[PDB]
Design an enzyme around this catalytic site. Structure first.
Site, PDB file in Angstrom:
ATOM      1  N   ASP A  80      -2.941   6.425  -0.816  1.00 41.92           N
ATOM      2  CA  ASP A  80      -3.082   6.983  -2.160  1.00 41.92           C
ATOM      3  C   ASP A  80      -2.433   6.091  -3.226  1.00 41.92           C
ATOM      4  O   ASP A  80      -1.587   6.536  -4.005  1.00 41.92           O
ATOM      5  CB  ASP A  80      -2.603   8.443  -2.250  1.00 41.92           C
ATOM      6  N   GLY A  81      -2.838   4.824  -3.243  1.00 35.71           N
ATOM      7  CA  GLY A  81      -2.446   3.918  -4.305  1.00 35.71           C
ATOM      8  C   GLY A  81      -1.619   2.709  -3.903  1.00 35.71           C
ATOM      9  O   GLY A  81      -1.599   2.299  -2.741  1.00 35.71           O
ATOM     10  N   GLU A 128       0.830  -1.192   0.000  1.00 33.41           N
ATOM     11  CA  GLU A 128       0.000   0.000   0.000  1.00 33.41           C
ATOM     12  C   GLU A 128       0.874   1.255   0.000  1.00 33.41           C
ATOM     13  O   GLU A 128       1.818   1.361   0.785  1.00 33.41           O
ATOM     14  CB  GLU A 128      -0.917  -0.024   1.228  1.00 33.41           C
ATOM     15  N   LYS A 129       0.576   2.193  -0.894  1.00 33.52           N
ATOM     16  CA  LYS A 129       1.268   3.479  -0.908  1.00 33.52           C
ATOM     17  C   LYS A 129       0.552   4.426   0.049  1.00 33.52           C
ATOM     18  O   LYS A 129      -0.592   4.818  -0.188  1.00 33.52           O
ATOM     19  CB  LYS A 129       1.296   4.070  -2.320  1.00 33.52           C
ATOM     20  N   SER A 130       1.230   4.801   1.128  1.00 33.64           N
ATOM     21  CA  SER A 130       0.588   5.545   2.206  1.00 33.64           C
ATOM     22  C   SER A 130       0.649   7.062   2.058  1.00 33.64           C
ATOM     23  O   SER A 130       1.539   7.602   1.398  1.00 33.64           O
ATOM     24  CB  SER A 130       1.178   5.134   3.557  1.00 33.64           C
TER      25      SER A 130
END
Lengths: 8, 373
Positions: free
Chosen positions: B220-221, B67-69
């Site tokens: 966010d992605g 997960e892109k935090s």
């Protein structure tokens, strides 16, 4: 030597 | 309610002081000597935007996905203080090579019960996030997703499993042991450190439905990290970041224009034109688009009772590719530069929808096992 490995 | 703004965003702030200028020259020199790079060059990797050609890439090579935090990407450097050679010191630094000195942070060495031994020449890649707990409690956390060097040994040339392997054993494990028995001393740490939750490249669905909605920070992605490639300083064509269209936002200068009627005066309660402007020159703006606003949102906007025109707004594209109001940006002097806008829109044009990404998963899974033969 150590290694990272998840599943699944 | 209040108008949506940047104050709604939980913004992580680096829990440290900027390192002095003479200190950063030593650190940059020390780091470059360790890695074999140029001193003023950021050694961290940068991902490329996920494009259509990257669906095939995921079929050809083994990948991890995390997960892109919502947080700050920074490298963690364990070393000795440039002025005090006998003082263990930890630095965080971002892509702009700004060093932050973090005190009262401590990484135990394995099997050392004295507590006097410390790590040097250790460099991690991670993200600094702010976890929110009930009761308005906040917890800073550093999520490690790569290791560049561990105890003087450079691991950049090794594969991902070995890089993350050495961090887990040499750093994470002793810290976990230490935390279990030294819980009091742990609570003084400016932040907690942990290995990032990772999945196999085809475990995307699990991230979306189980992991991401349970996080105590924002998302966010996704990041796709190849497990068959060495760590690359700068732009890595194998490191992919994916992001839904709604998260590719742009800051515009908003300007309201009211219909001047031929009869009587202007009806200011009626919906005006919402002009979005892009920043170019000094104070030179240019028309770019009209922000789509329905009647319900317009009433909501008026109910805010705040000035609307002549300010910076963050906008996003919807399913119909219309720019939509997201929030005000009072922390910005200007809208995005035209060069920035172009880049964002390019990531959208070459973008892959979430549906297409999911519908390509099983093919990626079977190829992964055909390689394990």
């Amino acid at each position: 030597s150590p290694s990272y490995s998840p599943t699944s | 309610s209040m108008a949506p703004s940047e104050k709604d965003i939980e913004e992580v702030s680096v829990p440290g002081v900027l390192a002095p200028r003479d200190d950063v020259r030593v650190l940059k020199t020390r780091i470059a000597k360790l890695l074999g790079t140029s001193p003023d060059t950021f050694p961290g990797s940068q991902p490329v935007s996920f494009s259509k050609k990257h669906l095939q890439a995921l079929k050809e090579k083994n990948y991890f996905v995390c997960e892109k935090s919502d947080g700050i990407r920074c490298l963690l450097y364990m070393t000795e203080h440039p002025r005090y050679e006998n003082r263990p010191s930890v630095y965080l630094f971002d892509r702009k090579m700004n060093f932050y000195h973090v005190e009262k942070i401590f990484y135990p060495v394995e099997n050392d019960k004295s507590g006097k031994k410390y790590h040097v020449d250790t460099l991690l890649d991670g993200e600094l996030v702010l976890d929110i707990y009930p009761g308005g409690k906040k917890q800073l956390r550093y999520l490690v997703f790569d290791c560049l060097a561990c105890d003087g040994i450079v691991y950049m040339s090794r594969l991902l499993d070995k890089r993350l392997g050495i961090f887990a054993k040499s750093i994470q494990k002793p810290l976990d042991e230490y935390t279990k028995t030294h819980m009091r001393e742990t609570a003084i740490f400016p932040f907690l450190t942990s290995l990032k939750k990772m999945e196999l490249g085809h475990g995307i669905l699990k991230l979306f439905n189980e992991v991401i909605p349970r996080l105590r920070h924002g998302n966010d992605g996704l990041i796709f990290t190849c497990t068959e490639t060495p760590y690359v300083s700068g732009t890595d064509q194998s490191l992919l970041k994916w992001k839904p269209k709604e998260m590719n936002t742009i800051d515009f200068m908003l300007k309201l224009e009211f219909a001047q009627p031929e009869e009587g005066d202007i009806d200011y309660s009626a919906m005006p034109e919402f002009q979005l402007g892009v920043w170019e020159g000094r104070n030179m703006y240019s028309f770019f688009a009209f922000m789509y606003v329905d009647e319900k949102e317009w009433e909501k906007l008026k109910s805010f009772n705040v000035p609307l025109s002549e300010r910076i707004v963050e906008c996003y594209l919807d399913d119909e590719n219309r720019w939509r109001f997201l929030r005000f940006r009072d922390d910005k002097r200007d809208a995005n530069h035209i060069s920035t806008v172009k880049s964002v829109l390019q990531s959208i044009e070459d973008g892959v929808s979430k549906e297409d990404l999911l519908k390509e998963m099983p093919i990626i899974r079977e190829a992964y096992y055909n390689r394990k033969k």
